[PDB]
Design a protein around this ligand. Sequence first.
Ligand SMILES: *[C@@H]1O[C@H](CO)[C@@H](O[C@@H]2O[C@H](CO)[C@@H](O)[C@H](O)[C@H]2NC(C)=O)[C@H](O)[C@H]1NC(C)=O
Length: 130
Amino acid sequence: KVFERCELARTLKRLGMDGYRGISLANWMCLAKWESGYNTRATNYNAGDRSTDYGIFQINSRYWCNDGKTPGAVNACHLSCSALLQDNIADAVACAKRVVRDPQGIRAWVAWRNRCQNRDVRQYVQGCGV
Ligand SMILES: *[C@@H]1O[C@H](CO)[C@@H](O[C@@H]2O[C@H](CO)[C@@H](O)[C@H](O)[C@H]2NC(C)=O)[C@H](O)[C@H]1NC(C)=O
């Protein structure tokens, strides 16, 4: 499923993402946009370290979810990577909250660092009623 912008904003707000660890809904929207274009089926394989990023938040298989084929995986979210490919994003959000609880926080997402950080991101939520 490829979410509509305001549709996703309302969904994340309902799931407790607005202001989670001080992170605004607009920041979460900015990173979903650049990481996956709001697509829950998005997957990207890293030939280099042999790991895969899954879903709307592009969560990596080495540290967060288990896909069974990644060397040295940890599975900190205690989730099967397939759960991050569902149309329902509840599991994705719970895992995304777990990621930000680690030392580096939101800096774990390459896309936030390159396109969202120190940038005005209000345009991601304007007109959504959130
Ligand atoms: C993106 O990949 C990087 C590593 O390529 C992940 O960062 C690691 O995260 C673990 C767990 O917090 C840390 O112990 C490592 O020190 C981090 N490594 C580096 C180089 O920063 C990052 O968590 C992944 N992001 C997502 C969203 O899965």
